[PDB]
Amino acid sequence: ENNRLSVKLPGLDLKNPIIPASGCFGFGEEYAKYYDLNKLGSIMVKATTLHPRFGNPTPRVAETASGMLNAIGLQNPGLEVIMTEKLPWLNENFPELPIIANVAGSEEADYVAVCAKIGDAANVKAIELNISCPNGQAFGTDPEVAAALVKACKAVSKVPLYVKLSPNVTDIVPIAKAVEAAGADGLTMINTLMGVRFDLKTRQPILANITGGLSGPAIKPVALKLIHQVAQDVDIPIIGMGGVANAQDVLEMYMAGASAVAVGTANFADPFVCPKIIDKLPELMDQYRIESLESLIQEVKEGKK
Amino acid sequence: ENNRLSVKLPGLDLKNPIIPASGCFGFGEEYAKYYDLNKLGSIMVKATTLHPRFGNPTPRVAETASGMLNAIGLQNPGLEVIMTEKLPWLNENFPELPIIANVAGSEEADYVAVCAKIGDAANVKAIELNISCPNGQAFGTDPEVAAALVKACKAVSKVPLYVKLSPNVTDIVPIAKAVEAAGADGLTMINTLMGVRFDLKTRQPILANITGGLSGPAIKPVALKLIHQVAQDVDIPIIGMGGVANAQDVLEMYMAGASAVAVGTANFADPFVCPKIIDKLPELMDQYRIESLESLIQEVKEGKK
Amino acid sequence: SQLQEMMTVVSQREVAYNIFEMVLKGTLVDEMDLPGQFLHLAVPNGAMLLRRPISISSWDKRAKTCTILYRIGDETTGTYKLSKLESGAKVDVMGPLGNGFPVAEVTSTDKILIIGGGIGVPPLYELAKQLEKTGCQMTILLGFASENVKILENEFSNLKNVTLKIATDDGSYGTKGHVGMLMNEIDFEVDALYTCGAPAMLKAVAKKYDQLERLYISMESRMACGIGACYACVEHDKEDESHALKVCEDGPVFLGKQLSL
Amino acid sequence: SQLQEMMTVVSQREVAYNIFEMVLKGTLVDEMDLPGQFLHLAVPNGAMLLRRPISISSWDKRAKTCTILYRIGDETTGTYKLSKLESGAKVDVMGPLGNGFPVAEVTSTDKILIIGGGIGVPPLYELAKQLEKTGCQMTILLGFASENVKILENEFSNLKNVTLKIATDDGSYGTKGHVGMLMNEIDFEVDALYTCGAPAMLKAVAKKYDQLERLYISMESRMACGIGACYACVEHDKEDESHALKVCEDGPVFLGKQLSL
Numbered sequence A, B: 001e002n003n004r005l006s007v008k009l010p011g012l013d014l015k016n017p018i019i020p021a022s023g024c025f026g027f028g029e030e031y032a033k034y035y036d037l038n039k040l041g042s043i044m045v046k047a048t049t050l051h052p053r054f055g056n057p058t059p060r061v062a063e064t065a066s067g068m069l070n071a072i073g074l075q076n077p078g079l080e081v082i083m084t085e086k087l088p089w090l091n092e093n094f095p096e097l098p099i100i101a102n103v104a105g106s107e108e109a110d111y112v113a114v115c116a117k118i119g120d121a122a123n124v125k126a127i128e129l130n131i132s133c134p135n136g137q138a139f140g141t142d143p144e145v146a147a148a149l150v151k152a153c154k155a156v157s158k159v160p161l162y163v164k165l166s167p168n169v170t171d172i173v174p175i176a177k178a179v180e181a182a183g184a185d186g187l188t189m190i191n192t193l194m195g196v197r198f199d200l201k202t203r204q205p206i207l208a209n210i211t212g213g214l215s216g217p218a219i220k221p222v223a224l225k226l227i228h229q230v231a232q233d234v235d236i237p238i239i240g241m242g243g244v245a246n247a248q249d250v251l252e253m254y255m256a257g258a259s260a261v262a263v264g265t266a267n268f269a270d271p272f273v274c275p276k277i278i279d280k281l282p283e284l285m286d287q288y289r290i291e292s293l294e295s296l297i298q299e300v301k302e303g304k305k
Numbered sequence C, D: 001s002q003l004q005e006m007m008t009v010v011s012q013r014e015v016a017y018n019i020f021e022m023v024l025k026g027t028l029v030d031e032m033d034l035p036g037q038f039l040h041l042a043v044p045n046g047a048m049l050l051r052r053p054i055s056i057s058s059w060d061k062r063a064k065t066c067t068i069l070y071r072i073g074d075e076t077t078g079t080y081k082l083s084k085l086e087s088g089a090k091v092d093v094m095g096p097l098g099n100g101f102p103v104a105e106v107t108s109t110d111k112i113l114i115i116g117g118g119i120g121v122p123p124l125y126e127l128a129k130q131l132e133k134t135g136c137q138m139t140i141l142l143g144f145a146s147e148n149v150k151i152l153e154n155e156f157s158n159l160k161n162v163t164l165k166i167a168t169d170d171g172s173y174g175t176k177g178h179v180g181m182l183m184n185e186i187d188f189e190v191d192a193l194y195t196c197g198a199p200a201m202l203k204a205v206a207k208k209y210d211q212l213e214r215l216y217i218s219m220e221s222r223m224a225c226g227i228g229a230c231y232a233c234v235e236h237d238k239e240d241e242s243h244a245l246k247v248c249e250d251g252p253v254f255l256g257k258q259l260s261l
Ligand SMILES: Cc1cc2nc3c(=O)[nH]c(=O)nc-3n(C[C@H](O)[C@H](O)[C@H](O)COP(=O)(O)OP(=O)(O)OC[C@H]3O[C@@H](n4cnc5c(N)ncnc54)[C@H](O)[C@@H]3O)c2cc1C
Pocket: B062, B063, C038, C050, C051, C052, C053, C054, C055, C056, C069, C070, C071, C072, C073, C076, C077, C078, C079, C080, C119, C122, C123, C219, C220, C221, C222, C223, C252
């Protein structure tokens, strides 16, 4: 890549700010067949839990206008398998690709166990605390509760801790502040909103889980609102996500206050969406008077109040 | 119309369940040029405030994927003008069209003044309390506060009181229950979610108000989730809205638990969307084994737990 | 019937840098009579629900066609997707809409001034065509950012009793500069003015001819419904305190100064 | 290159009640070799991002084309919008994808049974064409809800060493009833079975031939990514406790009983 696209975030020295979002890229195996994963700034792999999980019954996905619903249920092979097979595979093929490990769980002790171990993996450069799984969340809706968790995990993590916020709250500001004061090195947002779809013939919800998480271009305006809201009073970097489908969106996230950008749902529509964005980015920057993304971050940051 | 489409709701004897949503139909004058407003079950006119309001600076609208943002700012000519000109116009041309009056304000006393008067209008058959304006809301996020307001307005209203809920909350259930216990005859939901859009050239938000309300097909899954959630434990009817663009959507709202359906944003895309839905509805019902919407409501209601 | 129709694309060609000229054919042309009215076109993308408001540049009564000139943005805009339409493609159209330019209320002995710039120039073409059928003097002053953007010159100068003056900011073709420079040169006594262009240009025109009674300004705004129901496209009347004017229903065109209906 | 391509629509005709047959032309046909593989097609609507997974029914190597048979829903579905495509229109395609039917590992002396029903019938056509090139007995049992839905009969019976039996639930054409009735009649000793259809039908087949080693079942599921990364299209392995199988990568086709890889 080139200098104009590089950003420095805690634990993350990215060649470009394009990072596939958690749960949308597996552990990189499938998309490696499509293109050189080294073209990416980093990857946010699927949620890892202390114990392997099958997940929710099927159907697990549904389509909505400019978005989709999912209720996978945090399926993953467990920490042991992820530590011995998944992460090593990425480290063996793509040694220089920094990876962000997504961590989830049903209770504090579960989060703690994973955070304390997952950092041993040479290629894991940061942890993304998933306190926001929709269908996670019972930890992302109360500031004091979220803070308690973050503090505990921070005390045991060997790598920087990024916290993934939920958009399903009345006021995200108190939650963000609390999490920052508790020791979080950065934030990532947003996880999905909650939605439902009904099958007219059966009169029953399409998803077996009834409710699911809503993602895609449809939620971009909400993601921007929240990122912008949180950026106005947090002193730690934010990696934004929610409806990014092209380079223009990436730039819009920057205007909102993000430092790097994750792409989720778009990979399903177009498996080459990430490399495309990376390629179109410099042209777009030229057109909008942007010398480097590093300069854009600072410019948006000082143009506050 | 015909029997299969008629629904009986407090104060509302609708020929069909299609009602244009508040702020998307003005006071009916403009769309009357397009078609006979008598084809509609009812109309939800623009918010009325004690004092006339100009609203927010422009731009007031923006487009998003499968939706749009708006920050009109509650512009309306005031109660006096609405009582003497707007409502009388509808009563003179369409005497048999029941109308739902949307009420808003900055404080309890404002809501109270409007609710106490607006019911005098012969054609106003119900009041829709707007405690949810995004950009309203400072009343729709706390159960006790919402309840206090609803109780006061209910004591002064001569017509049934329907309360419009906000989707921008952590848990809508407590708010719904509180509002029901306070005397509300029914509920309508949802109002808009909050979003933002940035102009790449100016690096500034497109809307002058910065934030706006997000509506359109994009928010349908969220509307269904909430309606379904609330319907499981409220004993009063719900008029649903959020992303309805066709007859299939109307039926989906019914499966979720709504008794009638409002259509907002779709009118902008297609000014004949309402009459079209009304016409296509019977065919669709045939196909999905529905004899009457009145029977569908009961069926969905007893198929609970 | 008379409000919406699936018009047919007769042709679509790019006439200037990123500016397309589309010729539509349909019965809606029959309702057209006033210049400055607009069409609310629907984008061929289900994710883009808001119709784009574009003024009618001209129409052929006998041929049953109407012509619109419009600028496109990047791959993510609707105008871009609109410009991809071939011959025979259908376009969902809402119109004619809005209050047009007051034409049939002027003598055949008046000195008319028509000022335009950029994409505000198109509706002014049908204005001249309608005024040529009446009689007297017309002096059109058109301004552009660059020659690369210059449109409708060939057909404007092809009009009788018309005096055309072109100006260009940087990419020079005519007189170097802005339309404000041309306004300074004109000697004759103007009895009516018609303008349509960038807010900055409209400000210069309204300021220079502050007390010209027949000063018509065609405005632009972000719209949604396009018929006056949403209250999105609002402007202030004779000063902040008064009525609220909708650019889609009361406008596009209004009376003098910083807006009077 | 070899994973995605903007294929061209050679033709598209409705062959049965709401069932279309589309013939696509493109280089992707070169990678095709196994029957039962699928194509992930993109809907011509920006608001519908999820690609629809449709099996390949057959392909012509020399002509560089592939043919897919698919059912459409109402105005709001993507298949509906897909069926509106004319000759020359482009279709965004991802494929070949999935594990196909194991063909080149059977003798020219085996008794083959192929059971199909409804929209599960299409991929089974290329299966027979590939097995005809090998040699031995093939007995295809096809079931449909009604004659109005019946597809591919003319080309199935146009195959050598093939014995075709059609059944129809209500709208009778062949033997009145379900495929379960046909299964009861067959006398010969089957050495391999290939099935693709409704979950109910697949259950009857797997139950009747519980211990048939070479029992291949082509499965359906709600998908998203189509390559095995999203974990949406998941199924259970040899009993609940074991591995999780993805119908898009490990499948569509799996081994016997209520699923074994
Ligand atoms: C009454 C009227 C007449 C017009 N006549 C013409 C004309 O004859 N020729 C011409 O080239 N342009 C004209 N415009 C401007 C034209 O409508 C916008 O440039 C165009 O709608 C921008 O759409 P987009 O395809 O770029 O979409 P996007 O940029 O993706 O934006 C999507 C939404 O933003 C709205 N929007 C974005 N920018 C503008 C803008 N500057 N003004 C208004 N709406 C905007 C779009 O209409 C749409 O609803 C007119 C505007 C108005 C209000």
